Design an enzyme around this catalytic site. Sequence first.
Site, PDB file in Angstrom:
ATOM      1  N   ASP D  72      13.091 -46.552 -12.687  1.00  0.00           N
ATOM      2  CA  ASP D  72      13.901 -45.432 -12.066  1.00  0.00           C
ATOM      3  C   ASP D  72      14.407 -45.567 -10.751  1.00  0.00           C
ATOM      4  O   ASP D  72      13.692 -45.990  -9.763  1.00  0.00           O
ATOM      5  CB  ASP D  72      13.080 -44.122 -12.264  1.00  0.00           C
ATOM      6  CG  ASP D  72      13.781 -42.864 -12.189  1.00  0.00           C
ATOM      7  OD1 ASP D  72      14.442 -42.259 -13.006  1.00  0.00           O
ATOM      8  OD2 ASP D  72      13.756 -42.292 -11.007  1.00  0.00           O
ATOM      9  N   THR D 105      20.429 -42.516 -11.686  1.00  0.00           N
ATOM     10  CA  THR D 105      20.077 -42.415 -10.395  1.00  0.00           C
ATOM     11  C   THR D 105      20.370 -43.826  -9.833  1.00  0.00           C
ATOM     12  O   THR D 105      20.452 -44.189  -8.646  1.00  0.00           O
ATOM     13  CB  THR D 105      18.662 -42.042  -9.989  1.00  0.00           C
ATOM     14  OG1 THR D 105      17.793 -42.988 -10.788  1.00  0.00           O
ATOM     15  CG2 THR D 105      18.347 -40.585 -10.758  1.00  0.00           C
ATOM     16  N   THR D 106      20.623 -44.824 -10.572  1.00  0.00           N
ATOM     17  CA  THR D 106      20.895 -46.263 -10.243  1.00  0.00           C
ATOM     18  C   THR D 106      22.194 -46.471 -10.490  1.00  0.00           C
ATOM     19  O   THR D 106      22.869 -47.476  -9.452  1.00  0.00           O
ATOM     20  CB  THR D 106      20.161 -47.147 -11.162  1.00  0.00           C
ATOM     21  OG1 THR D 106      18.937 -46.935 -11.448  1.00  0.00           O
ATOM     22  CG2 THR D 106      20.404 -48.668 -10.623  1.00  0.00           C
ATOM     23  N   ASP D 403      13.189 -38.357 -17.462  1.00  0.00           N
ATOM     24  CA  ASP D 403      14.813 -38.532 -17.732  1.00  0.00           C
ATOM     25  C   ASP D 403      15.114 -38.217 -19.267  1.00  0.00           C
ATOM     26  O   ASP D 403      16.296 -37.464 -19.036  1.00  0.00           O
ATOM     27  CB  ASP D 403      14.755 -39.991 -17.597  1.00  0.00           C
ATOM     28  CG  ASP D 403      14.957 -40.523 -16.155  1.00  0.00           C
ATOM     29  OD1 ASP D 403      14.632 -39.466 -15.263  1.00  0.00           O
ATOM     30  OD2 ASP D 403      14.832 -41.613 -15.861  1.00  0.00           O
TER      31      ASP D 403
END
Lengths: 525, 49, 98, 540
Positions: D72, D105-106, D403
Amino acid sequence: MMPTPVILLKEGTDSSQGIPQLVSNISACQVIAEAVRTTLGPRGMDKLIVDGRGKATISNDGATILKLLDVVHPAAKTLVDIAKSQDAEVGDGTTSVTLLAAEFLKQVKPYVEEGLHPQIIIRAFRTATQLAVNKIKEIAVTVKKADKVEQRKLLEKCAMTALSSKLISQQKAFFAKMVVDAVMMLDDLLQLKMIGIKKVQGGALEDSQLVAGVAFKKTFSYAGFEMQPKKYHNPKIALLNVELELKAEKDNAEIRVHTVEDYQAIVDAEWNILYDKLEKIHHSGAKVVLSKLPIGDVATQYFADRDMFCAGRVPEEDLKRTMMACGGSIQTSVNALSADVLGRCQVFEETQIGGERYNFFTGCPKAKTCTFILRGGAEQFMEETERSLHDAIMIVRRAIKNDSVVAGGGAIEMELSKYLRDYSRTIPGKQQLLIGAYAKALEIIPRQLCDNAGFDATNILNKLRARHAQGGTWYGVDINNEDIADNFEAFVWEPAMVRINALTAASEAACLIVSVDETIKNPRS
Amino acid sequence: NVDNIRVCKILGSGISSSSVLHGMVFKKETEGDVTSVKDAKIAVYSCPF
Amino acid sequence: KVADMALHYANKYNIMLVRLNSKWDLRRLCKTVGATALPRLTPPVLEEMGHCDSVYLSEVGDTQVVVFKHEKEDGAISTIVLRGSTDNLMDDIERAVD
Amino acid sequence: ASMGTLAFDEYGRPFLIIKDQDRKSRLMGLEALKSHIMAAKAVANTMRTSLGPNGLDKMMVDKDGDVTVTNDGATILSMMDVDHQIAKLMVELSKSQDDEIGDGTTGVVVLAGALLEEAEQLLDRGIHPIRIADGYEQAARVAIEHLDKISDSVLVDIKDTEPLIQTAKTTLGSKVVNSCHRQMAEIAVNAVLTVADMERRDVDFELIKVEGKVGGRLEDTKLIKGVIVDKDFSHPQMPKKVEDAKIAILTCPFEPPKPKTKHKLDVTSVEDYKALQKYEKEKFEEMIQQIKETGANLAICQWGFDDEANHLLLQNNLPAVRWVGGPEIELIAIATGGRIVPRFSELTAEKLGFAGLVQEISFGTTKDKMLVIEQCKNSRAVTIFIRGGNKMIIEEAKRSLHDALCVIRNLIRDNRVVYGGGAAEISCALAVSQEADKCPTLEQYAMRAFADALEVIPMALSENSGMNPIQTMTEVRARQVKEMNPALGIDCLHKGTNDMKQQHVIETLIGKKQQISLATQMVRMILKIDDIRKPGESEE
Ligand SMILES: Nc1ncnc2c1ncn2[C@@H]1O[C@H](COP(=O)(O)OP(=O)(O)O)[C@@H](O)[C@H]1O
Ligand SMILES: Nc1ncnc2c1ncn2[C@@H]1O[C@H](COP(=O)(O)OP(=O)(O)O)[C@@H](O)[C@H]1O
Ligand SMILES: [Mg+2]
Ligand SMILES: [Mg+2]
């Protein structure tokens, strides 16, 4: 300096006197101005300052940057003080004040170096400032028609001009419409505490909303809160300042019994006191209960059993805003919960906003308040958005108080410089040089705008001077077109009081700094 | 009496905006909801309310 | 201090509450208004009641102030409101006023 | 170029402007922008290897030595210990993406790094950074409009959950729990659909209790349509299994009453002592009888209880559980359909919850017991109970399932979707490039730089999958241009097809829009900083 056996002042006292210390003061003011020089206009940039604790503050506001700078020079602190004063009285122009003051000092520096008496410079500054303020008041454009549409458009244009220098300048029309809507809700005092500003991490700038009511964060719900319904279609709101918990009747109350029956009676009496308060709240017809004081788990379950909503530990400001939005009264006693002390809202709802829960009171027609909800990708992002919105709000409030506007982008400064030069060309000549220096210093604003934008400031200044000389009061710097333009027709509007206060504060700071001939620093205790 | 002349200093508008008020000015807010009275009948208590 | 229940009932009866921490400020207000500082919470008699032409909450610059204003050019206490752009400048003006 | 200023006056007198100005540091101008861009590029290039199904995991160690293995992006950036302010801004950007969307989020960090990298070469050619920010904003608006144009709508009905399963599988593909891909996706979809206000309203994650216990297998993770409890029955000799339980949820300890106000009960004679002890015994018997009168088969208390009540409950065939937490009490009440009662006097048959089975569960050779309250009638609370071979995969499964739940929540909020694998990014880059062609010259460079930075996601996906980035990305873009199909992306799993719609690689439209918006705003905010004033004290 022959060392006396007994010295006059305490050992370690540093004294600076004469022309050199005044020149040093001017240089320090120049440094302070340079500290915020590049934060001027639509092409201005931001400043990042890290404190000792490691927290960083990113801002475009001149007053904020100056406050964060730990200035210790006695003469340089005057610029920070006048920036704070401009922020307090007006709210915008905190960079222009420092730039103007330092430019005044820089312009009179050569005359100071050649032994000119400071009192002459002070008198010249006072005369020039009075003339400039009178000229601003004379040539400021006012709309004496009392048209709601035109007045709102003036507010929006002023808000856009104030906002077109910050990181939210891309959404400046959107935020200006929001700010004009927000300010017009306030009734007569235009109190800042009546405009809530909530910052929720996550989301785009365009996701920011202005709720026509009150919204605040969820406040430590107890067990059984999730069983309460989270939407009401015409709720009566019970604004309270009451602790609905099982607790001692008083901190100095002692119960003395000598019978088990009396023991049971005392327990049942405490329970009955709590249930009597709850029944008085419930029978009033209210479906939403808010309180400053804690609301216990027993009360939460009681309200859940009756399909009611409760929220304890609501902050003072949020409860006051809810009262002003809904039309109730904050009650410290539940004995008289009449229909006229209960708030009314069209829709109450609890929703999810970026990982946090918020309570919404919408559809309030008689609302005298509003709440801003700001969405951004960082803490400092939201802080700077709030700062920009505060600048816009102060500008709009001042425009409500006095609707006189002048064209920005250096147009007003160029016009004042031309007028002051024309006046100075008709006086004996000792004051003529100083008034001309004041007029030349007035050119610092368009020159700095061009420098920040990457222009050639000399050509733009020459064109502006030629235009103002041959006619045209409102010609200023056009950032997008790399040229000059009539900034009044371009809706670069700012209230006249902003420039009036800027000139007044800059002149006062310059006169105060010039008037000092000696600095004495006593040793630290 | 020299003491009978009070000075209140508020930033913002330059010393040319100074004025003389026949009364007193206190830098604070009101505790209650009422914020304006036109025919004041002040009752003053040294004891806590 | 002001109690919560006392404040609630003052709001219920439309009473403007002002709290003064300094005893000197209280004495000066009594002198400039014409009231007697009662030591208890008894209702004031006619002679002990103060009078003023207007009391209101106002904002000067960014400061919230409470103004006890007399219309007549009289009274026991007069206040000079000093404006300015710097604290040091206002201190100097106050010295000149002294 | 640092240490503020150093002049000491032209007359030799001291020149002190700022406190500790000889220790503070300053960086201004284009050098500050270059340093910020380089730090952001370092962060983004560190994070870009954890993108896609073939992405690898970062293994973070905190200050106490505890080890976290995760994929994550927000968690990785939170665990990082950084001083650079731009790095903190990137961490906050990942936190913002996690808060608003919960997925991607990446991608935000990689996009921001690519944007700043392109802005670097734009700045080297003499373009004002404000112009670059304005061009980036214009291109972001174009890309968002294109995303709205090329979106597709899926059904979010309980009757047919297949699109939801596909979307959850796409979300979980990059995580380590992909060995139980469909199982995890389906339990996440069912969990979200169970606890949700159907009228497109919010999904309250407080109704989803995600708890993990070591042991077992990752495939043993299951969805319990009830509540899991870390407690057990108070008396060791009560039955471990209750069927058709009528639960009495209580928040009053099974103890003699105690007034809240400070009190003293005076015993002045022997008769008073006898009356007091008789009263205590009668109170115990009375509370037990009051519980038994409602017909309850099981009692749950929040504040524990003592030996007499315990043995009376055992003697009356009333299995009881004590010291249940408040959140667990609320969850049990919600799931079983029963009310929370504050005292025995208010306990009635109508306030009793119903659960089809209450059981005590052992966990091998660990003597640890836990309770399952399941088979409820219409339970509106759900529990995800995760097993694994070590606590680290358990934590990773927890965040991966979070997620997936966030993604299904996003679908509930808005059901429009786009196709991943870089197809959406490639289509947006094509739209931005086409818009730049019919645009004035000066901002064309900014818009084309935005398109090139958008192209980083397919290149990173191809690189992580072992393919040539430029060749594959160019081929996919050419195929997208040739036949009008914005669903063609990077075939990371080597399934033999580039059509990402057939591969069922689906991601929320709002997720991509939020990614683009957040990246653009952060890049603009960073580009506007032209001066840094650090204390520079290097304190210990
Ligand atoms: N759109 C615009 N075009 C040209 N000049 C502008 C524009 N908007 C603002 N300005 C100028 O920028 C100057 C500074 O404004 P700003 O930096 O927002 O606050 P401050 O006055 O505190 O520096 C103002 O004097 C104004 O004339
Ligand atoms: N099966 C797949 N084949 C190809 N690409 C995929 C597949 N699943 C996900 N992706 C892509 O991998 C990218 C990164 O997704 P992921 O690593 O799961 O989360 P994050 O977006 O937080 O990095 C997404 O943009 C998505 O388009
Ligand atoms: Mg401004
Ligand atoms: Mg993902």
